[PDB]
Design a protein around this ligand. Structure first.
Ligand code: ZN
Ligand code: ZN
Length: 688
RNA sequence: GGUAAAAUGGCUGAGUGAAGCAUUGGACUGUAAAUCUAAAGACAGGGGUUAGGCCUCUUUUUACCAGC
């Protein structure tokens, strides 16, 4: 077969603060993703990009925002059933993959291949990929540029020209003739030499593109001195059609970098990916939040997404900003396409909401009907399960007990993007008030994103000049193993975390080391809390919950994912609010016990038997992520948890009226789940 | 919400072009059932390479989504 005739270069991530720059290559035979940062999988799912079917993943910098989402992509590939997958990047990649198996489990069902930089190159029928290691003058100092060249595209045959004279067009005899013409062998027939030039166009050797990342000025000189780039610079046998620079704005304005890259020539297109992007990625989440805000303000606050404040400076050659969903076309025609750019238009969402069936009447009735502690802020950053999707992110909740103190509690993959989308530009101040973080259990979706929040908190603290206060993390002994396995070859950031085992915090437990001594004290008398206790749950090995009591006598208990635990009862008694799991729903008791989930019915049961004033669910299943069915058991002490939800103690006599409008908003989706899940599960149970 | 499999007609086998069973007037047959010399409906809805077969966007049908 001939060379590919449809190659597209697209960006899934614009290199924003939330997530690092990510590329995407679409070809008729193979697909590539290059850098796999945090949240790139969710963006690909949102943009309809096929998560599976990926052939190669190329890593450049080996940095968390560039490799944080690799675990999620690997898990998704494993679930999808992809048989083969190849990973390439720095030679120490295999070490990172090994640490993943500690908590992610064996990678059965999918074959993973690690290609170190020592390998010469990787061949393909669609294009060839090289690798030129780069070393800085100042291991996190190693970056790699790939440089990709396409294959020969055979010229099309002039069928009309051949038919004009009387060649056997439309018959099997034409196949050898066209095969010989395309190959390059002259064909003589009918007593004359037709020659290939009169039957086909000259062959096209194909273009090429270069991917290079310059984290800082330190890498400018090594890049300039690179010998390989010299051959492709200026005139060359394979002109480079496009080059992408994943470098900060300051580095781009550097005179040396501009002079070196200017040798590429005027025909070379340049693309820059950095924090200066001006595109919005998640339209569905923004629409959902805007629609929810129309019901009750101050409980679903507007995202107030950050926006660029400085226009890109003029340079020697015009530049095209990274943006989102920007695609560059190769092979058929070299041009830029912008027919799929994402823009935020809240007016359309408002108009669509105004046309909802009877939603306006319900909202008006609720408003007509509507018409204590002031800062017990509780915000649910995420409420979904593992494998985050567009509608919601993995479970993650934060509480702002005091303006100067806060508790992160569970923190899943990333969640700094969620924090930025929630508080906007105010995250910098908020991130500096973080006091401690607690992980639920060994599952990756609850503790995989810790490095990102750690780095972001460190950056925020350094921005204001405040000294460095080590963060307190309450995780089992399993987490420390992963942390020590990591950071030994990439970052060495062990100074930003202090471990406090949860076993010593268990009710009736005893301190087993002086390290916890004065450490529990530092944790206390700082969050306005009186004693902190934990206990095991019936979920899996090394699973613990947390109970927090304020100095004023307000008590809140968080359990997480587990079966109804009798030990939890009699310990969280008189708790103002409680947090449980509602992964599954009624009618799936067999799956609930098999999957080790309480389910909504058992959670509500313990809720009435727990005496807690308020019962709040969490960790909604992906099958009912849009909204869980409101069972008749709902009472004044229950509620519904949603992403970016904000609830105060004074809202207790206010939320009951929200059920009608919330159920009205989700009509089509609720009908879909009712028609799909309940009947199917009932039929399956009856058959079995 | 995601993954796997098939979209051809009254039914059904594939990709040189379309192949097998069923019926319209009936001949052997007083009798309308035996064996045909003609008949027909024809590859779900787009588009990229020019070609069917290849890849992508929707629509309809079956199955699956579990404790680390
Ligand atoms: Zn879990
Ligand atoms: Zn969980």
């Amino acid at each position: 077969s001939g060379g590919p005739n449809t190659v597209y270069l697209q960006v899934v991530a614009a290199g924003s603060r939330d997530s690092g720059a990510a590329l995407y290559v679409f070809s008729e035979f193979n697909r590539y993703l290059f850098n796999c940062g945090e949240g790139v999988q969710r963006l690909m799912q949102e943009h309809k990009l096929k998560v599976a079917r990926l052939d190669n993943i190329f890593l450049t910098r080996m940095h968390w925002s560039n490799v944080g989402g690799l675990s999620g992509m690997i898990l998704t590939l494993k679930e999808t059933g992809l048989p083969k997958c190849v990973l390439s990047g720095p030679p120490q990649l295999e070490k990172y993959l090994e640490a993943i198996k500690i908590f992610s489990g064996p990678l059965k069902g999918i074959e993973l291949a690690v290609r170190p930089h020592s390998a010469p190159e990787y061949e393909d029928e669609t294009m060839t990929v090289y690798q030129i290691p780069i070393h800085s003058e100042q291991d996190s100092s190693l970056v790699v540029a790939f440089i990709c060249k396409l294959h020969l595209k055979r010229g099309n045959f002039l069928v009309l020209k051949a038919k004009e004279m009387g060649l056997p067009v439309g018959t099997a005899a034409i196949a050898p003739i066209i095969a010989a013409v395309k190959d390059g062998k002259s064909i003589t027939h009918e007593g004359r030499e037709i020659l290939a030039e009169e039957l086909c166009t000259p062959p096209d050797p194909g273009a090429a593109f270069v991917v290079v990342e310059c984290p800082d000025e330190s890498f400018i000189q090594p890049i300039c001195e690179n010998a390989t780039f010299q051959r492709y610079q200026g005139k060359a046998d394979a002109p480079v059609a496009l080059v992408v620079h994943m470098a900060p704005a300051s580095v781009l304005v550097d005179s040396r970098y501009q002079q070196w890259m200017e040798r590429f020539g005027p025909d070379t297109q340049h693309l820059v990916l950095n924090e200066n992007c001006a595109s919005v990625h998640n339209l569905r989440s923004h629409k959902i939040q805007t629609q929810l805000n129309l019901i009750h303000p101050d409980i679903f606050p507007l995202l107030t997404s950050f926006r660029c404040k400085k226009e890109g400076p003029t340079l020697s050659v015009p530049m095209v900003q990274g943006e989102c969903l920007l695609k560059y076309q190769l092979r058929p025609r070299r041009e830029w396409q912008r027919d799929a750019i994402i823009t935020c238009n809240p007016e359309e969402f408002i108009v669509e909401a105004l046309q909802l069936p009877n939603f306006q009447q319900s909202v008006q009735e609720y408003r007509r009907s509507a018409q204590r502690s002031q800062y017990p802020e509780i915000i649910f950053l995420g409420t979904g399960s593992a494998i985050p999707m567009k509608i919601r992110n993995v479970s993650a909740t934060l509480v702002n007990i005091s303006p100067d103190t806060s508790l992160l509690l569970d923190c899943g993959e990333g969640t700094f993007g969620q924090l930025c989308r929630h508080y906007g530009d105010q995250v910098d101040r908020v991130l500096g008030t973080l006091a401690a973080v607690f992980v639920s259990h060994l599952h990756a979706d609850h503790h995989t994103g810790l490095p990102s929040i750690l780095l972001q908190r460190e950056r925020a603290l350094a921005s204001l000049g405040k000294p460095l206060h080590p963060l307190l993390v309450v995780a089992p002994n399993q987490l420390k193993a992963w942390l020590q396995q990591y950071h030994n070859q990439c970052q060495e950031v062990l100074h930003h975390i202090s471990m406090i085992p949860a076993k010593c915090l268990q009710e009736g437990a005893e301190i087993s080391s002086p390290a916890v001594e004065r450490l529990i004290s530092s944790l206390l008398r700082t969050c306005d809390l009186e004693e902190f206790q934990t206990c095991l749950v019936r979920h899996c090995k090394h699973a613990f919950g947390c109970a927090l009591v304020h100095t004023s006598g307000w008590k809140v208990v968080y359990s997480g994912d587990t079966m109804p635990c009798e030990a939890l009862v009699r310990m969280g008694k008189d708790a103002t609010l409680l947090i449980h799991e509602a992964t599954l729903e009624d009618g799936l008791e067999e799956e609930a016990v098999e999957k080790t989930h309480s389910t909504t019915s058992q959670a509500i049961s313990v809720g009435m038997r727990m005496n807690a004033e308020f019962i709040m669910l969490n960790h909604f299943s992906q099958r009912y992520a849009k909204v869980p069915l409101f069972s008749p058991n709902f009472s004044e002490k229950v509620g519904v948890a949603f992403d970016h939800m904000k609830v105060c103690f004074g809202d207790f006599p206010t939320m009951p009226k929200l059920i009608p409008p919330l159920k009205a908003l989700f009509a089509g989706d609720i009908e879909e789940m009712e028609e799909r899940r309940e009947k199917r599960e009932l039929r399956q149970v009856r058959a079995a």
